[PDB]
Amino acid sequence: MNDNYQNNYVVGRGTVYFDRFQDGTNRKTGEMYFGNTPEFTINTDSETLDHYSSDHGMRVMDASVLLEASQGGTFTCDNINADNLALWFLGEVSNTTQTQQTDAKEVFNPIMRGRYYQLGTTDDNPTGVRGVTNFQMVKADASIAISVGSGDITSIVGATVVNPAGNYEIDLEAGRIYIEPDSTDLSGNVQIAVQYDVDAQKRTLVIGKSNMVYGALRMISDNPVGLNKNYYFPKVSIAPDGDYALKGDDWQVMSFTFKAMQLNNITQRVYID
Residues 230-249, interacting with a second copy (CB under 8 A): 230-232, 234-235, 237-249
Cite the DSSP H helix spans in 21-81.
none
With CB under 8 A as the rule, give the number of residues binding a second copy: 145
Per CB under 8 A, 103 contacts a second copy? no
Position 183 contacts a second copy (CB under 8 A)? no
**Smaller CB distance to a second copy: residue 153 or 174?**
174
Cα separation, 27 vs 30, whole angstroms: 10
- Which residues have a Cβ under 8 Å from the Cβ of 64 and sit 6 or more positions away? 48, 49, 50
CA distance 66 to 48: 5
User: For residue 234, what are the CA distances in angstroms to 23, 28, 73?
Assistant: 16, 10, 14
Residue 127 or 154: the one with the smaller Cβ distance to a second copy is 127
Is the distance from CB of 23 to CB of 225 less than 8 angstroms?
no
Residue in 1, 16, 161, 184 binding a second copy, rule: CB under 8 A: 16
CA–CA dist 76, 247 (Å, integer)? 17
- Is 206 within 8 Å of 86 (Cβ atoms)? yes
DSSP-derived secondary structure for 122-140: STTSTT--S--S-EEEEE-
Rounded Cα distance between 224 and 11, Å, is 8
Select 159 or 196, whichever has its Cβ closest to a second copy. 196
Q: Is 221 in the site for a second copy (CB under 8 A)?
A: yes
Q: Interface with a second copy by CB under 8 A: which range of 29-37, 143-151, 161-169, 194-202?
A: 29-37
- Using CB under 8 A as the binding rule, whether residue 251 contacts a second copy is answered as yes
> Does 262 sit near a second copy (CB under 8 A)?
yes
- Over the window 54 to 73, marking each residue x when it contacts a second copy by CB under 8 A and - when it does not, the resulting string is -x-xxxxx--xxxxxxxxxx
**By CB under 8 A, residue 97 contacts a second copy:** no
Q: Is 157 one of the binding residues for a second copy (CB under 8 A)?
A: no
Binding a second copy by CB under 8 A: which of 140, 190, 194, 260?
260
What gap in Å lies between CA 48 and CA 63, rounded to an integer? 10
Q: Does 43 bind a second copy (CB under 8 A)?
A: yes
65, 47 in Cβ contact below 8 A? no
Residue numbers 186-205 binding a second copy by CB under 8 A: 203-205
Query: In terms of CB distance, is 161 or 245 closer to a second copy?
Result: 245
Half-sphere exposure of 96 (CA within 13 A, CB side): 12
The nearest distance, CB 216 to a second copy, in angstroms, is: 15
- Is 40 a binder of a second copy (CB under 8 A)? yes
Q: Per rule CB under 8 A, is residue 132 in the interface with a second copy?
A: no
> Could you say which of 122, 144, 161, 209 contacts a second copy (CB under 8 A)?
209
80: contact with a second copy by CB under 8 A = yes
